[PDB]
């Protein structure tokens, strides 16, 4: 399993920053073989990202933060896989904890997105993860099993074929609570195992990134675990140094 | 009231298409000056749209098809008014029927976006409109007033100053009915009259666009009515010759 490190920029970007960051990023990662590095900028900046990376002749993968369920038509305001494809984007974050909470995206909704992306030749980065209370209640796997089965129990285990899964420890996050590399590995082993129950080939191959708070000096403690295959990075993704660091750590560590 | 004709491109666009459309459109509007022409492409193409319009020295206005409630922060996949301002996008469509239906956006949500747009210096194109069963049940004004009050009752009529309102007869859309310039004009005066009950000054100046199916053949019919101040165009927006025809008719109708 080749590690994959993705930067989720979220709702951050500007014309100056995008160029700076992507250039800095390219510099830092100059010849840093071993990992797959991807960026997910706001839709408004996918055009710029593409142009900047292409000039730079960069190897960074272009992604996007969500998708909708149609390629074209009377769908005012929607995100189209076919349109994203025109800019080279290929890694689409879906089910993120923020969309699920704020936009009330459901398991079935996110599963349809999963299927449509795959149908379009794109790579889904399916996010799963339990709340603070589902965690206090010791329901972590009930939840992760649930969110994952919405795909498996419809499309079938195979469907995770060439997809990335990202585990979000929503329970931690400024709430004084913290996930450790041990917690992370514990959990990632259970998820993989859940997949190994229907298919072991699939399970051993599926990249399962860790979505918790990972920093330059966390990174290798995490990338050491055998079931953690990369990271979906939040804040560190906004800094070329920090983010390249995390990418490097995973490259070697693996 | 100076007319505004906006093309909502919906889920339509491509690199080659965006530049051909904007270039032909700008060629067609050469002497035209009595109508504001705005264009709303998918977010993915707002940058390309800007680049094309700028190179051309075009006067066409850039807009977008939706917005969210934050400028920056932890909101994966959201739309930012501030990021939109960087590309020069000013007219922002909110409340469109396709979002109200497919994304279940409430009047409360839509109203929150209106206030945020005003907070950021942008122009909201507030869509309102009733369905088939409401129209048959003849509750057109209760629905429209309900939806306008969402912003009026929480922000004051003056909040409409500088905004654009687009009536969408959804009942006519996709369900065998048809609106006429005469039915349209009747609905716009009721809408204007509701706003006027709170402020005459605001009501006199607000641009209320017609959102039904407008086409180059039926446009002068609509722009002829005194309470129809432009159009929010869909399908006819995708062609430079059709969209420019609708813009021109509005220009003359209101000269």
Curated annotation (Swiss-Prot), chain A:
Thermal dependence of function as given in the entry: Optimum temperature is 15 degrees Celsius.
Localization (cell): Cytoplasm
Pfam families membership: TIM (PF00121)
Catalytic activity: D-glyceraldehyde 3-phosphate = dihydroxyacetone phosphate
GO cellular component: cytosol
Top EC group: isomerase
Pathway: Carbohydrate biosynthesis; gluconeogenesis; Carbohydrate degradation; glycolysis; D-glyceraldehyde 3-phosphate from glycerone phosphate: step 1/1
One GO process term, biological-process aspect: glycerol catabolic process
Chain residues that bind substrate: 8-10, 174, 213, 234-235
Active-site feature positions: 96 (electrophile), 168 (proton acceptor)
Main location class: cytoplasm
Molecular function per GO: triose-phosphate isomerase activity
Keywords noted in UniProt: Cytoplasm, Gluconeogenesis, Glycolysis, Isomerase
Residue ranges crossing the lipid bilayer per the database entry: none
Top-level division of the source organism's lineage: Bacteria
Entry keyword Cytoplasm: yes
Similarity comment: Belongs to the triosephosphate isomerase family.
Described purpose of this protein according to its UniProt entry: Involved in the gluconeogenesis. Catalyzes stereospecifically the conversion of dihydroxyacetone phosphate (DHAP) to D-glyceraldehyde-3-phosphate (G3P).
Subunit details: Homodimer.
Name used for this protein in its record: Triosephosphate isomerase
Gene this protein is translated from: tpiA
């Amino acid at each position: 399993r080749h590690p994959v490190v993705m930067g989720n920029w979220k709702l951050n970007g500007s014309k100056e920053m995008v160029v700076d960051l992507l250039n800095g990023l390219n510099a830092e990662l100059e010849g840093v073989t071993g990992v797959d590095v991807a960026v997910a900028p706001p839709a408004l900046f996918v055009d710029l990202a593409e142009r900047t990376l292409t000039e730079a002749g960069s190897a960074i993968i272009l992604g996007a933060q969500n998708t909708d369920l149609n390629n074209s038509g009377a769908f005012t305001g929607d995100m189209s896989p076919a349109m994203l494809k025109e800019f080279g984007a290929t890694h689409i974050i879906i089910g993120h904890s923020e969309r699920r909470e704020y936009h009330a995206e459901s398991d079935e909704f996110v599963a349809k997105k999963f299927a449509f992306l795959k149908e379009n030749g794109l790579t889904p980065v399916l996010c799963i993860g339990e709340s603070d209370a589902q965690n206090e209640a010791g329901e972590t796997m009930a939840v992760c099993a649930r969110q994952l089965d919405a795909v498996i129990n419809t499309q079938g285990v195979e469907a995770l074929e060439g997809a990335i899964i990202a585990y979000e420890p929503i329970w931690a996050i400024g709430t004084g609570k913290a996930a450790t590399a041990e917690d992370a590995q514990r959990i990632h082993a259970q998820i993989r195992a859940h997949i190994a129950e229907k298919s072991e080939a699939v399970a051993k191959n599926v990249v399962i990134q860790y979505g918790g708070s990972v920093k330059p000096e966390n990174a290798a403690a995490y990338f050491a675990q055998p079931d953690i295959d990369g990271a979906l990075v939040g804040g560190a993704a906004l800094d070329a140094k920090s983010f390249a660091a995390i990418a490097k750590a995973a490259a070697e560590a693996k």
